[PDB]
Ligand binder design. Structure first.
Ligand SMILES: Nc1ncnc2c1ncn2[C@@H]1O[C@H](COP(=O)(O)OP(=O)(O)O)[C@@H](O)[C@H]1O
Ligand SMILES: Nc1ncnc2c1ncn2[C@@H]1O[C@H](COP(=O)(O)OP(=O)(O)O)[C@@H](O)[C@H]1O
Ligand SMILES: Nc1ncnc2c1ncn2[C@@H]1O[C@H](COP(=O)(O)OP(=O)(O)O)[C@@H](O)[C@H]1O
Ligand SMILES: Nc1ncnc2c1ncn2[C@@H]1O[C@H](COP(=O)(O)OP(=O)(O)O)[C@@H](O)[C@H]1O
Ligand SMILES: Nc1ncnc2c1ncn2[C@@H]1O[C@H](COP(=O)(O)OP(=O)(O)O)[C@@H](O)[C@H]1O
Ligand SMILES: [Ca+2]
Ligand SMILES: [Ca+2]
Ligand SMILES: [Ca+2]
Ligand SMILES: [Ca+2]
Ligand SMILES: [Ca+2]
Lengths: 367, 367, 367, 367, 367
């Protein structure tokens, strides 16, 4: 059976092809002790173990904005995934990996070299995340908006054909929203600075943040009463209360100037991607906006996207946002479907054709 | 076998590693005759012999506030410990010594030079007292409050890692409480002035003093009736009676302004040490307050610490004070466990590496 | 004429706009008697009077890390500043106040409410300290590194435009270095514990501490000879000698792990702030590193910053550290220039627009 | 007008507030006949009358070491003071009384009960003797060394604030020196045994004893020649000659081991009191050593104290001993100043607040 | 062999060291003829010869109250002791002499000068009588009450250390009791006036006097019946009868006011000496009251001392009076033990060190 490993900037989603859910979901973090040991303990911790000991660790993400920046730490995470989480021998399982579009070419070349020389997989494949999200929705046409921890990207697909010139990629996703929430939480006197405290702010974001339908009207409501304020208990028992920060943090997705970026929000980027496509397919793309990734899980984000794109598109077009309840795992679920197709069993990069072409084989066999 | 010698400001606790109790416990005192001998007697007396002849001696503690101030007298005490109490040859026993944190560096350097050049030990090691107390409790996480005769100090440890920036040290312990009891005993007309009479007041403190749960409510009870008053027979048959002095003396631990100190009490110091630690480990520290040392042996001190820290900590935190019945010997018991570990046998400072680095070897091998 | 009051965590710098130096510079401290008065004396002392009577006082800083934590004590300091130091009526002087960036919003709201309701100023304004430092240097472009007693912060400014997303703030400044010096002075047997003795250590720091160009090479020099050791006479005539503590204390600015912080040093933070800025302005920022505040007054800190940033920046960039000799008062001097500009006279928050908008007016009129 | 009564162990100093000298100075003695009356005389004699009839009386001091041990005899002395010496009605005069610090609490409680119930004073107050000595010197800062007939005590005061934890009390004063002189006078064959003869030795002490600057060098001078020997005529015409006894008797103040005491001399005790004070006030205490009491009236004691403290203090400190010529009455003179202050008229313990609180009112109204 | 000469006020006890009893015991008297010789006899008689011819002699004691008042007569007694009683050459025997404590310094200086220049002893030593009594009892701890013919003195010794400040000396002993018995014998009409008749009264005292357990109850018994009356035959055959004089004479030891002295009795003096000692040794002193000297030989004096001290001491203390049957010679027996110790042979004052230091050598070599 094939292995499906979705190495996100934030989480590792790993499992076996054919299943309906990832078997192993854990943070893509490596932690190392920052204090001195006095009781006569490992050199580093990975995943959930690093998350539970984060009080005495410095946490490092080896993947930033979909790009692997620390290959020694990324090998620790893959090793932890295969041997400790899946408890499997990689030498007998074809491994399907994922990647954001418009990534550096050396990224997937080094992924290929490590899978074939360090883990000795029989075959591997690198798919594009947004394409897998369309497999999970059971569609062959649609513009996918995938937003994870590192990258937000749009990929328009029509009848199984990608329009690569219309692919959009924005280096603004969950981790940037977490950093922004940390910044605006200082307005109320709350100081989160360490990498461990960043994990606390991320949990605050996932529980209390939501997308306002009308941002300026929501800002007036939060300034007139405390009906929007909610409380959250920190790990040490302290209770913090946040008001408009709940919807100001996800508003960065629609107004990237909040964090100093010049790019347009995800609604304009989606519309700009559709407008780069041929005029005869735009109507089908307007009706099949597929959202995937953890950053699309904010309450109200589908209604806001619906409202924003409707204002940009012609009035006669039917705008439909497809937001499945399980869209946090759409990339893995789509990869599980793809790796189980009988038509896909010819698409694997085998060890034989890697030995005669080097790691550059991945560029002429994977989109 | 290894020797474990806990040189406290008040008592010497010495024994062999692997045992469950110190073999030799005696006062860390040197006494010299202050009168003229007329019957044709030693130049000085050490330990229990000085305590039994204290009527004609001036008693001197060579260790004050965990710092050895008289090295000639300290050598007499170590000599008495090895040859008279343990009856052992130090040249064939690795010796584990203890020290309070944040001590002067010359203190443990001169300890190393004396052990290697005067007693010619094969190896030695200087541990921190609070760390050894955590070994004795069988824990790897907790904030240790060790209070002996000289020093009260807090050391937070999480998963075997010390947080040195959160270590607190207060030069207020048993000997300061004894001096304060001597002062407030003059309110009833009892005058203790000599060093021998200070030993009598110390015995009064250990037998009659206790910690009040509510100090101001206890002061009103002692002022309304004599139900709190207790009697004590002096060595010469005189009987003294003390009332609120029983709980006013240990109250100095929680209100150091009684003796003119500006520092906060041991409850606030414990809380300040926890608040200096990372927020993700505070909950485990709140549940693992370990008390050790003779000054934590007052009846009611665990209930008072529980009450005081609960008022400082958030209401959802579970405050648990660990006060073992044998906590007066926790430092020695922990040192006996550490010196018996197979993983510790590489941590000794051997005579070979001392001959090539001098006494400064102790700073890069001992915490 | 306008009043310029720079309320630092450590010092109050106050004076009149148009002058070239603050008229009143005194410690931002409130002292209260901790002993019992027996001679038939005020309830509290402020500023220089508290510093001269500190032997019998407990000293409190109302501002910690640029945040006012005791508003009753802060009102005493402002009252002392206006009526006793400047000897002025605040009801007839617009008051320019300063603040660190990324402060809690309630801080400058309560500053506005006190200035308008307690002191009844006609107008006020809250400026950012680093921006004022750029006014003092006569520049419109540069990255300001301001480090006082409470906060170290970087603000990059290009052609008069701030890049707020690149603003960095580190809660590590002079007071943390003083606390660290107090800790490592115990290595030589010197014990400073009281708030009054902390003022002695601060004076030791300002006179003997310096920044080593190469820290590890300086540590080897101090360990081989006593050429680096210097003496200092305490107020009671005792003489202390310190060696490597002279440069170990300021080294915390470049290695915050000395005090248990995870953040990067001030050189990496400066470089990270420049790298967050647009690529077209980085060359001008590299050539205009402006240092201000008392914590940048260590001998050798400009040469060390020059060396550290040069190692981080590309080799073709010209790194220039601007360290004026009067940079301890740059914030006040810049505020004196700003409050005297004819273009600034429209920027004041007047009492009229405060009466119709409440203290929240300060957020939409002050950066 | 207020009455100022300084009840010393040796002398009663009584007078009216506002005066510059006590009106009544007489010995605090009660004498009773020890022989049989044959001529057909009182039951007891008080003060100067007991001193003139001491040949046929047994003399008793009701105050020993500042503690009233015979309350029936002490009432006789107070009665003699009010009605026979001052010739006044105590029911119309507030009475200021004095006491040594660290006295039993029952001492000043019974003083309060007798003044309010036996003599029916309208108001009373119990001051500390050393504090009054500082009033007499016109100072608000200084360490007072008061040594009378019963108690030697040090009280450091800074800016009107006492440091109670630094108060030192030594039960070694004039009466112990008299007893020691009686003992060493037997070396020359002179035998004084009765209580009446003790009064003769006291007069010898006050006339011939002095403090040697260098004791061992003075002992060699007295052993080589008779230049130090002086004569004294006893009441019966016999002439005695004393040599080194002149300076051996006051040397007990600096070497209390002469009379079997373990405590340090008055110079070390003064230095130990200063060293218990905060480091920032020690320089002012070194320059303001105030001496008071009859036992500081030995010729050369200020030069000896100056020499001894200079050897203990750092070389850069300026040691200044303040020894007024009228320092034998400093306690009374200071009490006369205090009782005449307009600010003190609220400090009296009135009869009204004594009737509602009992004699325990004196503890919460008097230091 | 060494000579041990105990020169008491009443008797000379002389012998050789190592023996268990003095070889020569005779009265310390010199008699001279007071009538005219008519038969054609010495100029003076010494010792037993003076006692047998006392009818025609005037008897003189050269020692009064332990002080040699007639040095020409004392030389006659020493000459009689060496040549007539011991029949020995003093030039070949080290001589141990005794003395009461608190004696004039010239007394033992002139003893040293006479022994070295008149008798030319090779070495000599002056011991304290009470210390020798403790040697005789085989103890190293105890308070010795030695009462001879001239002096009653208490010396507390603990573990071989004397407490000189607690030494008590009372110039009331056997000779004062003899004089008092002579006075109260006139109540019955018996007149003894001459020095020879004083020797008769002394013999009456030694045979008939005893100490009453309860004095006032014994006085009532003697006044109701004649059961206490005893008879005594004078040398001329006359028979005298005495009643309450038997116990009134020794009662002066417990009530010195009988002879006009102000001092306390021997029981209070013993208790006052113990109370001057450190509190930790009082229990051992209470259990080791050693009595010595001829004046402690009255029947019932140990039971009376036991009863009197028990009433003064705390009820939990065990009072034990050690009264050996041979305690009349305890000083000599102890001196015989001391002079025979091998450790004492370095303590002698030799003729060599006397020739270089003069008679003042005795003060820095003898206690
Ligand atoms: N309920 C939620 N609301 C908002 N954000 C969420 C929620 N759940 C997860 N996220 C965010 O989604 C991001 C990563 O999710 P995921 O789609 O797995 O991306 P990746 O594949 O990069 O790990 C994280 O930054 C996380 O904060
Ligand atoms: N039962 C008790 N109650 C109160 N204090 C005690 C008790 N037992 C011992 N102590 C105090 O503990 C102090 C020293 O104990 P210890 O922990 O051995 O410290 P150290 O290691 O410094 O000798 C002494 O000052 C003693 O007075
Ligand atoms: N010469 C110096 N060397 C090192 N530090 C100094 C020097 N002078 C002042 N400082 C430090 O600067 C800090 C505060 O200076 P300042 O810039 O006025 O800050 P603030 O505005 O917070 O008062 C103090 O902590 C002080 O110790
Ligand atoms: N000139 C002097 N020299 C030495 N001692 C003196 C002199 N005058 C008085 N004294 C001593 O001072 C003591 C008491 O003086 P005082 O200060 O009045 O004390 P108190 O208040 O206890 O009576 C007496 O013991 C006396 O012997
Ligand atoms: N049995 C006795 N009862 C009472 N007193 C006695 C007795 N025997 C001797 N004494 C008295 O003891 C005194 C001297 O005895 P001793 O101890 O030898 O003293 P010293 O050494 O002064 O001669 C004499 O005064 C004598 O009266
Ligand atoms: Ca993803
Ligand atoms: Ca200890
Ligand atoms: Ca500042
Ligand atoms: Ca006095
Ligand atoms: Ca005798």
């Amino acid at each position: 059976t094939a292995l499906v490993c979705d190495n996100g900037s934030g989480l590792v989603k790993a499992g076996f092809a054919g299943d309906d859910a990832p078997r192993a979901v854990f943070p893509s973090i490596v932690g190392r002790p920052r204090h001195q040991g006095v009781m006569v303990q490992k050199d580093s911790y990975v995943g959930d173990e690093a998350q539970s000991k984060r009080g005495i660790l410095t946490l490092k993400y080896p993947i930033e904005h979909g790009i692997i920046t620390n290959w020694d730490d990324m090998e620790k995470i893959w090793h932890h995934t295969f041997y400790n989480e899946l408890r499997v021998a990689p030498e007998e399982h074809p491994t399907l990996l994922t990647e954001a579009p418009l990534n550096p070419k050396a990224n997937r070349e080094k992924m290929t070299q490590i899978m074939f020389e360090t883990f000795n997989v029989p075959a591997m494949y690198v798919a594009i995340q947004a394409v897998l999200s369309l497999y999970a929705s059971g569609r062959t046409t649609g513009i996918v908006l995938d937003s994870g921890d590192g990258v937000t990207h749009n990929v328009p697909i029509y009848e199984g054909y990608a329009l690569p010139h219309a692919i959009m990629r924005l280096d603004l996703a969950g981790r940037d929203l977490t950093d922004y929430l940390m910044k605006i939480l200082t307005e109320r006197g709350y100081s989160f600075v360490t990498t461990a405290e960043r994990e606390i702010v991320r949990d605050i974001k996932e529980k209390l943040c939501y997308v306002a339908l009308d941002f300026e009207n929501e800002m007036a409501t939060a300034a007139s009463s405390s009906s929007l304020e909610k409380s959250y208990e920190l790990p040490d028992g302290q209770v913090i209360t946040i008001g408009n920060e709940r919807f100001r943090c996800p508003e960065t997705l629609f107004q990237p100037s909040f964090i100093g970026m010049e790019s347009a929000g995800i609604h304009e980027t989606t519309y700009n991607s559709i407008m780069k496509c041929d005029i005869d397919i735009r109507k089908d793309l307007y009706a099949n906006n597929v959202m995937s990734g953890g950053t699309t899980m904010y309450p109200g984000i589908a209604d806001r996207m619906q409202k924003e794109i409707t204002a940009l598109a012609p009035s006669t077009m039917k705008i439909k946002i497809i937001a499945p309840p399980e869209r946090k795992y759409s990339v893995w679920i789509g990869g599980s479907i793809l790796a189980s197709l009988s038509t896909f069993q010819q698409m694997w990069i085998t060890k034989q054709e890697y030995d005669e072409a080097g790691p550059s084989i991945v560029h002429r066999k994977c989109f």
